Amino acid sequence: TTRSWDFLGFPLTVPRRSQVESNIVVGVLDTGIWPESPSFDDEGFSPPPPKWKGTCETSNNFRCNRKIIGARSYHIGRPISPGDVNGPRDTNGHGTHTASTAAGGLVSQANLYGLGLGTARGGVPLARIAAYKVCWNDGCSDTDILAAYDDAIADGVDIISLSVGGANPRHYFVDAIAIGSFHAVERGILTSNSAGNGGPNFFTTASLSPWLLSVAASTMDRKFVTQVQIGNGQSFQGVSINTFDNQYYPLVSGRDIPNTGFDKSTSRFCTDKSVNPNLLKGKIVVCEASFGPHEFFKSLDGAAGVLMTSNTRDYADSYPLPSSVLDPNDLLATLRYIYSIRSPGATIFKSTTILNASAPVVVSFSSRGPNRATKDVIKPDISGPGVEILAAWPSVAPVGGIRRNTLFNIISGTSMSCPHITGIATYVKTYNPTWSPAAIKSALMTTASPMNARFNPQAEFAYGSGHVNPLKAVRPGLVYDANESDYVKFTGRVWDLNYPSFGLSVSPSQTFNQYFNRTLTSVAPQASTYRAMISAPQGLTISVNPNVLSFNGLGDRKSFTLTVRGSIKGFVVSASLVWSDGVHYVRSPITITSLV
Numbered sequence: 001t002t003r004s005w006d007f008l009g010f011p012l013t014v015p016r017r018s019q020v021e022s023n024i025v026v027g028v029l030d031t032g033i034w035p036e037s038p039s040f041d042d043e044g045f046s047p048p049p050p051k052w053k054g055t056c057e058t059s060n061n062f063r064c065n066r067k068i069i070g071a072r073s074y075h076i077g078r079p080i081s082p083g084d085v086n087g088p089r090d091t092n093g094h095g096t097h098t099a100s101t102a103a104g105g106l107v108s109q110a111n112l113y114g115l116g117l118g119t120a121r122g123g124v125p126l127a128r129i130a131a132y133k134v135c136w137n138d139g140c141s142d143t144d145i146l147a148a149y150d151d152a153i154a155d156g157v158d159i160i161s162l163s164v165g166g167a168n169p170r171h172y173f174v175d176a177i178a179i180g181s182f183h184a185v186e187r188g189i190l191t192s193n194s195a196g197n198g199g200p201n202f203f204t205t206a207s208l209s210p211w212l213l214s215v216a217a218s219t220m221d222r223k224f225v226t227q228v229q230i231g232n233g234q235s236f237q238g239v240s241i242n243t244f245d246n247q248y249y250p251l252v253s254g255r256d257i258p259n260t261g262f263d264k265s266t267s268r269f270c271t272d273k274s275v276n277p278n279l280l281k282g283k284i285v286v287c288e289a290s291f292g293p294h295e296f297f298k299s300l301d302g303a304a305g306v307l308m309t310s311n312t313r314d315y316a317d318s319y320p321l322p323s324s325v326l327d328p329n330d331l332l333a334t335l336r337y338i339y340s341i342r343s344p345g346a347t348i349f350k351s352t353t354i355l356n357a358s359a360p361v362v363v364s365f366s367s368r369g370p371n372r373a374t375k376d377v378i379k380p381d382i383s384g385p386g387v388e389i390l391a392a393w394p395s396v397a398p399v400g401g402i403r404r405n406t407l408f409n410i411i412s413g414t415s416m417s418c419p420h421i422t423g424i425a426t427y428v429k430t431y432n433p434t435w436s437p438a439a440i441k442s443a444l445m446t447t448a449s450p451m452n453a454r455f456n457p458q459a460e461f462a463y464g465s466g467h468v469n470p471l472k473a474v475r476p477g478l479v480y481d482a483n484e485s486d487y488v489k490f491t492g493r494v495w496d497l498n499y500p501s502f503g504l505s506v507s508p509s510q511t512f513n514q515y516f517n518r519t520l521t522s523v524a525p526q527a528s529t530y531r532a533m534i535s536a537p538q539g540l541t542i543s544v545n546p547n548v549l550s551f552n553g554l555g556d557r558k559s560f561t562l563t564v565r566g567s568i569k570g571f572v573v574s575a576s577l578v579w580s581d582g583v584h585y586v587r588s589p590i591t592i593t594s595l596v
């Protein structure tokens with residue numbers, strides 16, 4: 001967050017409705033919260049809003065304050081697992097990180113052993129936080145998620161941040177998250193939900209409810225790298241969150257130190273104890289594979305460092321030993337070096353950063369649509385920074401497998417982009433306190449910055465409407481509004497659901513002719529006239545009627561019909577509709593797919 005907000009064009013000095021923001025409550029359903037974090041200090045805060053009805057559990061030495069005004073925990077139907085501690089306290093770290101990303105106060109000199117040094121903060125530093133612990137070492141059960149929703153809605157939260165999700169698609173009314181969020185929506189409470197980390201294949205997201213704001217994860221300009229310099233002077237740019245100081249060590253290949261009963265064929269990967277523990281003590285081992293902190297403890301005990309490799313390095317992770325993930329070619333160069341001299345060595349440097357001009361790009365793991373339940377409703381809905389985010393961390397929770405002297409941690413996931421969107425949606429709410437969940441969501445989607453389909457060919461099924469743009473979302477001009485009824489209304493076709501985007505499923509090479517009805521509501525007091533601008537690939541005939549709309553003022557509503565005709569050869573074809581009065585730009589992508 002020391003860079004993400006700035007990257008989004010949301011500096012520390014953005015305008016704010018402080019009194020309103022100070023009375024908004026952000027509900028966070030996660031692994032609980034660590035109250036001692038600097039991000040949750042309450043100096044200067046006034047008492048909890050009169051509307052607040054939530055309570056504060058005291059188990060496990062927990063104490064609420066004027067910042068964290070609510071703290072609950074749920075663990076229905078089974079005994080706790082090793083590592084779990086009854087109470088609302090965050091012993092995992094995930095909930096403290098997401099909560100601080102959404103509403104953490106400004107914390108200067110925020111860093112992880114110097115990495116990412118700057119001022120950390122959430123979208124709404126003045127907002128109150130109500131934590132609901134529903135995730136434990138055995139996961140987050142349907143029963144607890146629903147328990148949290150039942151209380152949160154009644155307690156008075158204004159918005160919900162949910163960085164959790166199911167692995168497989170389920171029908172809305174036999175899905176705890178869909179059910180809870182639906183009832184939250186009927187009470188005017190929006191839920192920002194992570195899309196999932198099961199990408200990059202199509203059909204991997206389970207955040208399918210139309211009423212949910214589903215969020216993908218994308219990169220930012222800052223990128224952590226870990227330079228590795230072998231003995232001959234060659235320098236390779238690897239990827240990892242490496243906090244260890246530079247140091248020269250002897251180098252060794254897993255291929256040349258097979259463990260008992262193993263041979264070069266498998267020892268080259270270093271996994272499953274395939275490398276001789278006696279031949280790698282105090283050395284940097286070269287492994288032709290990539291793995292996590294667990295494997296380090298399982299097969300590499302004794303090593304001074306580890307060099308891994310992978311074809312996918314669009315995000316960095318921390319490890320229990322100095323390490324870096326090298327590109328295959330650099331791994332090959334390292335091996336040639338090893339066999340070019342009798343005593344090879346290398347130095348793994350402490351991580352540094354580079355500027356990636358391609359950002360934002362949806363990251364490899366971000367879950368992709370189409371919507372498995374309602375294939376005509378595009379998912380995910382939008383993208384935000386979810387790669388290498390620095391935010392609050394419990395001083396006792398491990399980082400990369402081990403305990404370290406830090407109050408912050410750098411991690412990636414749609415669980416990191418979700419709270420950025422929560423912070424932004426909340427900021428929008430401070431300026432438009434009467435808006436419905438659908439309206440707030442519409443604002444973020446119609447002002448989202450278009451992303452490059454050449455860097456993410458899956459297009460809308462990877463990033464939805466695009467990259468979130470905070471300052472533009474505050475005043476969208478017009479919104480595609482909706483309420484509980486619309487989601488269960490019978491007209492009830494699907495192409496008539498007033499959604500901020502248009503989705504159509506067809507067959508390849510065949511011709512089609514479908515139409516969508518929509519209604520725009522002006523959210524600005526000044527009147528103006530909008531004209532429609534359509535951009536469609538060859539082979540498609542897209543038109544809107546009317547193609548001009550005038551709004552007389554705040555709340556004025558105008559309907560229109562969109563007709564799409566033609567055929568497609570590829571799996572995904574993208575087009576777009578933009579309504580503009582010269583001041584506002586209301587963009588809705590149109591996606592045609594032949595995927596089944």
Ligand SMILES: *[C@@H]1O[C@H](CO)[C@@H](O[C@@H]2O[C@H](CO)[C@@H](O[C@@H]3O[C@H](CO[C@H]4O[C@H](CO)[C@@H](O)[C@H](O)[C@@H]4O)[C@@H](O)[C@H](O)[C@@H]3O)[C@H](O)[C@H]2NC(C)=O)[C@H](O[C@@H]2O[C@@H](C)[C@@H](O)[C@@H](O)[C@@H]2O)[C@H]1NC(C)=O
Nearest residue numbers: 200219311312313314327356358359361364454455456457
């Ligand atoms: C600046 O950021 C960009 C975006 O993250 C980096 O480019 C990406 O690099 C990764 C490797 O870490 C590439 O991953 C391979 O992806 C292919 C499949 O590609 C196709 O599908 C993906 C979606 O899954 C689309 O995004 C692509 O456009 C394409 O349609 C897969 O078969 C491989 O097994 C890898 O997973 C990724 O494709 C690439 N994205 C783009 C848009 O280029 C970029 O990384 C540098 O450039 C790439 C090409 C590699 O040479 C890296 O080693 C380089 O580091 C990064 N730049 C820097 C300097 O870090």
Ligand SMILES: *[C@@H]1O[C@H](CO)[C@@H](O[C@@H]2O[C@H](CO)[C@@H](O)[C@H](O)[C@H]2NC(C)=O)[C@H](O[C@@H]2O[C@@H](C)[C@@H](O)[C@@H](O)[C@@H]2O)[C@H]1NC(C)=O
Nearest residue numbers: 491495496498515516517518519520556557558559560561
């Ligand atoms: C597209 O959805 C619109 C939802 O607002 C429909 O218009 C609304 O129709 C209501 C009648 O059931 C009427 O009370 C509302 O005032 C009106 N909303 C506004 C202000 O536009 C629209 O229905 C058609 O168009 C309206 C103007 C009437 O002529 C209806 O009889 C039409 O069916 C929907 N368009 C479609 C797909 O027909």
Ligand SMILES: [Cl-]
Nearest residue numbers: 056057058059
């Ligand atoms: Cl208690």
Ligand SMILES: [Cl-]
Nearest residue numbers: 078079080081
């Ligand atoms: Cl128990």
